[PDB]
């Protein structure tokens, strides 16, 4: 009863593939931007299983194999990029990410790389133009951020006590006492003696940064910098390397797109492979034979018949 449902050139899918591919289609369903939900799910895993087919079948003309070996050299070189280590947590990561047993998610890695070299091969993806990345930029300015400029007053405990830090506090809340008192003061402390040394050499200034690349440095010093407007004062807060602190943003500027250049590059590429291949298995499906045996989808998808005599 594991009856053929259609052929795609070479490749035969039979009613079992279906059944195996059930579960796989299923975690995918996420990911698969593009799927028309008015089609039946067995409508919607037939045309999964076809474009796999189409690209099965066109790697095999174009001599791209992909064997157990190749299989754990892409792991290994995707580890090599992702900075992982032992195999093991290799295996948690991915599942996180697809939602998907690590022994189901290695079987797309084929799928993965011939897509990949058929890419490099067939299809064509010019770079993005500077008018498409100055357009990407104006109209998605909520995508874009935003920088800022600060000084902060970073005082570090000598001693483990709880007197010290009672002391620090208060030595601190005293400091911002004064900064709202006189401003032109944090300059003038900044540059004092009871800053961080590296901090009194550059004024206490830190100089256009995103919250973001500030949260990889420090995580506490960012939550608390990117809610304060131009010349907002930190409350006293804590270092991540235990010293009591004191930040005033002295400045905020949408991030200038020539930092952002390389990124909405990426965006804009990776959106240009997804649709010119999209369009190559759909063109791809008129060039390869196919032939469906399946009576469900053959209605559903509107096939015809040879002499289907006309009602009249």
């Known amino acids: 009863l594991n009856r053929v449902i259609a052929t795609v050139g070479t490749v035969s899918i039979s009613e079992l593939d279906l059944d195996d591919a059930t579960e796989k289609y299923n975690r995918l369903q996420k990911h698969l931007k593009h799927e028309d939900?008015?089609?039946?799910?067995?409508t919607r895993i037939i045309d999964f299983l076809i474009d796999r087919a189409i690209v099965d079948v066109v790697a095999e003309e174009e001599s791209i194999?992909?064997?157990?070996?190749?299989?754990d050299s892409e792991i290994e070189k995707r580890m090599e990029v992702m900075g992982i280590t032992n195999r093991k947590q290799f295996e948690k990561t991915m599942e996180t990410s697809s939602g998907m047993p690590f022994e189901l998610w290695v079987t797309e890695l084929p799928y993965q790389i011939k897509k990949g070299q058929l890419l490099q091969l067939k299809i064509?993806?010019?770079?993005?133009n500077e008018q498409e990345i100055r357009s990407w930029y104006n109209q998605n300015k909520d995508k874009v951020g935003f920088e800022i400029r600060y000084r902060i007053i970073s005082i570090a405990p000598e001693n483990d006590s709880i007197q010290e830090e009672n002391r620090l506090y208060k030595e601190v809340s005293e400091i911002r006492k004064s900064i709202l008192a006189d401003p032109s003061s944090f300059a003038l402390i900044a540059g004092s003696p009871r800053n961080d040394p590296a901090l009194?050499?550059?004024?206490?200034?830190?100089e256009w940064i995103s919250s973001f690349d500030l949260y990889k440095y420090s995580k506490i010093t960012a939550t608390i910098a990117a809610?304060?407007?131009?010349g907002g004062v930190s409350?006293?807060?804590?270092?991540?390397?235990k010293r009591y602190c004191i930040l005033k943003i002295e400045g905020k500027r949408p991030t200038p797109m020539e930092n952002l250049r390389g990124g909405i590059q990426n965006i804009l590429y990776r959106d240009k492979e997804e649709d010119t291949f999209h369009r190559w298995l759909k063109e791809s499906r008129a060039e390869i034979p196919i032939q469906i045996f399946d009576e469900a989808y053959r209605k559903e998808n509107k096939i015809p018949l040879k002499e289907?005599?006309?009602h009249l």
């Open 65 to 71: 194999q992909v064997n157990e070996q190749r299989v």
């Open 235 to 241: 409350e006293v807060f804590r270092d991540e390397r």
């Open 124 to 128: 064509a993806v010019p770079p993005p």
């Open 37 to 42: 939900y008015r089609k039946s799910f067995r």
């Open 227 to 230: 809610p304060l407007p131009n």
């Open 308 to 310: 289907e005599t006309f």
């Open 200 to 206: 009194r050499a550059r004024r206490g200034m830190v």
